[PDB]
């Protein structure tokens, strides 16, 4: 069973290293998600709940199952209690429990790695929260940014020298695309998936930046 656990861990690790990278970073306006994504309709970054967003790297069907299950959890909880009782830490916690179970009991572990981000409710003063859940269910919250998928250390190094708190949307996006560019082995609008949790939106904070708007923000 040390055999089985090692082999499963390595299957998951190699599965994520082979996958495109995703970056999530806190900025003055909330949380920013940038991912390497050629597709027009298949999406690695998603809304979970009012002030809670989701990002994933790895095998699409697997992290999509987790995204849908996460939405089911958030919607059921918000109905059972109140929308304001649904929190980032809760979704990060359920994912840690779920992926722990999957990693230990499914035929094959999930080759996925997750980020749950939460911004404050409209009119409140609360620092963004970012959570990183790994394939075996390990969970860690990071204060500034999270990187997932592919070769992480070049991207994380680029950010840890490049990152400044309270950046502009243009500044945070530019540093983010630079850090992603350090780890790729050819990017632009057609090659990116971008979305933000906007702490200024009144209720639903998740909003996408596509096409002309994205191009205007990348030229800075």
């Amino acid at each position: 069973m040390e055999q089985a656990m090692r082999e499963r861990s390595e299957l998951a690790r190699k599965g994520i290293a082979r996958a495109k990278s995703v970056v999530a970073l806190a900025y003055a306006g909330g949380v920013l998600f940038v991912a390497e994504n050629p597709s027009r309709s298949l999406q690695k970054i998603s809304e979970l709940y009012d002030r809670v967003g989701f990002a994933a790297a790895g095998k699409f069907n697997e992290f999509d199952n987790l995204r849908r299950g996460g939405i089911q959890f958030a919607d059921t909880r918000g109905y059972a209690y109140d929308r304001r009782d649904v929190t980032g830490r809760q979704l990060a916690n359920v994912y840690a429990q779920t992926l722990g179970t999957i990693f230990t009991e499914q035929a094959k572990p999930y080759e996925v790695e997750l980020c749950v981000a939460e911004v404050a409710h409209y009119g409140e003063t609360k620092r963004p929260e970012l959570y990183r859940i790994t394939y075996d269910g390990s969970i860690a919250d990071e204060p500034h940014f999270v990187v997932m998928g592919g070769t992480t250390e070049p991207i994380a190094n680029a950010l840890k020298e490049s990152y400044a708190e309270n950046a502009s949307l243009t500044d945070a996006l530019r540093i983010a695309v630079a850090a992603l560019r350090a780890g790729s082995a050819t990017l632009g609008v057609a090659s990116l998936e971008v979305a933000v949790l906007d702490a200024n939106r009144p209720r639903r904070a998740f909003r996408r930046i596509t096409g002309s708007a994205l191009q205007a923000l990348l030229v800075d």
Binding site: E47, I71, D75, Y79
Partner: protein, 223 residues
């Protein structure tokens, strides 16, 4: 209870009274019966309060659930069908006294002509639905008074402002002939609630505007 909804050029409006009753006793004066259920749809419900709010809440959650899961909101026909399925689901309990009839008002963004993209859908206890091609509809114990009022006042609807006014006036005629429907309370400043929906979305109309139209109608009948 009375909830009315009517189309005007480029949008739709829904308004509902504020009265809560148990037999002849007034158990509430400020109750809200008209809800924003999604960015382009509003729902007003009549009947047993527990069930009515349960319906509105669950229905808004169901729509948003579909939208987050599938990256796109439901078609308007799909929304009608889900409310219908919910109502018929409740028919057994409704037979025993737990009745809730909804009225749906929305703006169909995928409509052919944005001029006539407004939609008004009424239901029955079996979950039967009607997409109204005559401009107005109402539900509740005062619905026949309100509909008969709008039959005479609907010709005066030319924009969002006249349509809102006419809606409050039908709710006024309903409250005048139906004791379960509460009219404008000029001492406490409690008036019907209304939602307006156009291409810019669905917004709850500011209470001051209802107080102005209410007192406007009251004087319109005092002279």
């Amino acid at each position: 209870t009375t909830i009315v909804a009517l189309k005007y050029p480029g949008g739709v409006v829904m308004a509902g009274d504020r009265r809560s009753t148990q037999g002849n006793m007034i158990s509430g004066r400020d109750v809200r019966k008209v809800y924003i259920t999604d960015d382009y749809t509003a729902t007003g419900i009549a009947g047993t309060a527990a069930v009515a709010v349960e319906f509105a809440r669950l229905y808004a959650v169901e729509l948003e659930h579909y939208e987050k899961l599938e990256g796109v909101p439901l078609t308007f026909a799909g929304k009608i069908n889900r409310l219908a399925i919910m109502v018929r689901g409740n028919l057994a309990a409704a037979m025993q006294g737990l009745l809730a009839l909804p009225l749906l008002a929305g703006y169909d963004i995928h409509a052919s002509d944005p001029q006539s993209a407004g939609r008004i859908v009424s239901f029955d206890a079996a979950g039967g639905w009607n997409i109204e091609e005559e401009g107005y509809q109402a539900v509740g114990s005062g619905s026949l008074f309100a509909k008969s009022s709008m039959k005479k006042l609907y010709s005066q609807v030319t924009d969002g402002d006249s349509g809102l006014r006419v809606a409050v006036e039908a709710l006024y005629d309903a409250a005048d002939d139906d004791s379960a429907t509460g009219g404008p309370d000029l001492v406490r400043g409690i008036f019907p609630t209304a939602v307006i929906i156009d291409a810019d979305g669905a917004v709850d109309v500011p209470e001051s505007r209802i107080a102005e139209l209410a007192r406007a109608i009251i004087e319109s009948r005092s002279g």
